[PDB]
Amino acid sequence: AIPAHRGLITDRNGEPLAVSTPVTTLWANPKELMTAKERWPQLAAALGQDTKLFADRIEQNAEREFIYLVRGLTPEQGEGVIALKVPGVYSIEEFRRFYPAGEVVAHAVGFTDVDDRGREGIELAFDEWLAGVPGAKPGKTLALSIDLRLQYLAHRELRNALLENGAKAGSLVIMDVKTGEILAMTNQPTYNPNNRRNLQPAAMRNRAMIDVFEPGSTVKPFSMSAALASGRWKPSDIVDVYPGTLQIGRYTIRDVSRNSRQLDLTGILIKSSNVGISKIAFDIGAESIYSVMQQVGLGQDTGLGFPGERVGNLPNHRKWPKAETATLAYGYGLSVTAIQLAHAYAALANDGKSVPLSMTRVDRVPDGVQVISPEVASTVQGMLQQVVEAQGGVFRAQVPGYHAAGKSGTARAYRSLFAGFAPATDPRIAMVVVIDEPLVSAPVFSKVMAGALRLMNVPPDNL
Numbered sequence: 001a002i003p004a005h006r007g008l009i010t011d012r013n014g015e016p017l018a019v020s021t022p023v024t025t026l027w028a029n030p031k032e033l034m035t036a037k038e039r040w041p042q043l044a045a046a047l048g049q050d051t052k053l054f055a056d057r058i059e060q061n062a063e064r065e066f067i068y069l070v071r072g073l074t075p076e077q078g079e080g081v082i083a084l085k086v087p088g089v090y091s092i093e094e095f096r097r098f099y100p101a102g103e104v105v106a107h108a109v110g111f112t113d114v115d116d117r118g119r120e121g122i123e124l125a126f127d128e129w130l131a132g133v134p135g136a137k138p139g140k141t142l143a144l145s146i147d148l149r150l151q152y153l154a155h156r157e158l159r160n161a162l163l164e165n166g167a168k169a170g171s172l173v174i175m176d177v178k179t180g181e182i183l184a185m186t187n188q189p190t191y192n193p194n195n196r197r198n199l200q201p202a203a204m205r206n207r208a209m210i211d212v213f214e215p216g217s218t219v220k221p222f223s224m225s226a227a228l229a230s231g232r233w234k235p236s237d238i239v240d241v242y243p244g245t246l247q248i249g250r251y252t253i254r255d256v257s258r259n260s261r262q263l264d265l266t267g268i269l270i271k272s273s274n275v276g277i278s279k280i281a282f283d284i285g286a287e288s289i290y291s292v293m294q295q296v297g298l299g300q301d302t303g304l305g306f307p308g309e310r311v312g313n314l315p316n317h318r319k320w321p322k323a324e325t326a327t328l329a330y331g332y333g334l335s336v337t338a339i340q341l342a343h344a345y346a347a348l349a350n351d352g353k354s355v356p357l358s359m360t361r362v363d364r365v366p367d368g369v370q371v372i373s374p375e376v377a378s379t380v381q382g383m384l385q386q387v388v389e390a391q392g393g394v395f396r397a398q399v400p401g402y403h404a405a406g407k408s409g410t411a412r413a414y415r416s417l418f419a420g421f422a423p424a425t426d427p428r429i430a431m432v433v434v435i436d437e438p439l440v441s442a443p444v445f446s447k448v449m450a451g452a453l454r455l456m457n458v459p460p461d462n463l
């Protein structure tokens, strides 16, 4: 079996992320080795192996005709060994993977097993494209959708934010709302795929795709989309939330800011009123809200074929009582990933058209599905822009130079969420920030979005 050169993984711009690099493996015929047995200690020594352990192995495999001595040496370490002229000690020309961007893109790229077979991330998800057949024809080059500049910016800013708010884990997703491309996907903690002899299993977790949480107030825009499509609600319509609590038989819904009476629909998002969103949910029914949430992909299969990727659960109760109707509308009757939430915000930002997710470079954009009507999506866009701009809004998420739109929330162990997109008047990027915890994340959205849009030469719309 003559191993094949493995396809190069680059980022969307050609920066190398996984490189098949030639190495020398030394193998040995044990039967031939029992012949040159006064040579073993020199072989053992030049292999870094204990003389008696080395002798025990050879003696143990005395029957066999093929064993490995060392895998993956550089071509002149193995050159030095066979230059010792030991009978029965030969060569096999293999390839080892090296990951030049290291821990910056570890979870997305993944890595190979000892036999150069895809074991995590893109390396696994596209193993057949990348492998090609042993002898021996070489695998195929793959350009990810990741932009290493945006990835590094997200990685650096997310790690800082965890160090600021004393947090341990978290993730950040950046998406092209127009093409479906995942421009950045970064997790903390992360790990160096070039030195994974010693890496904890918690840092191996691709949180953005695996960590499932109730998204809370971040799905209020979708509950509000259902409201605007029902035909019973215009943006300037009024809901009375006084006194910030609402009794549902036994349950009591409680707002965080209990300082309002009448709120228009934008006000319900600015103040993030569970009372107001529930009252609207009672009026329109949970079926409409479930439908928008399912249509934008919340709790649905992302279809990336990514290893480990989880789906969450959007339960289709078919008929919802009042309590489950409200708990769905303000985001605790479902479970999602950061990737699903970003895809949903992408659909909202892309004038209600959902373009399918892609972890590889998209040259020919597939046609999307109009999942939210363009009028409703553009209305909700304006409301979310008011959530960031307006008085009492999430000011720490404002992006200097541009108009940004978005929604904070608390996920549920809790996590701070910010989901948003920019620029508000011709959106290009959706972003989801997840910081695990024992408006933390709105500043990170601000920093990372400011840089991402500038890296993409997106002209300021705040003129």
Ligand SMILES: *C(=O)N1C[C@H](NOS(=O)(=O)O)CC[C@H]1C(N)=O
Pocket (backbone or CB within 6 Å): 215, 216, 217, 218, 256, 271, 272, 273, 274, 408, 409, 410, 411, 439
């Ligand atoms: C949303 O996640 N929730 C509703 C409310 N919104 O506040 S926020 O704008 O900081 O997200 C308070 C937090 C949470 C909830 N506990 O119901």
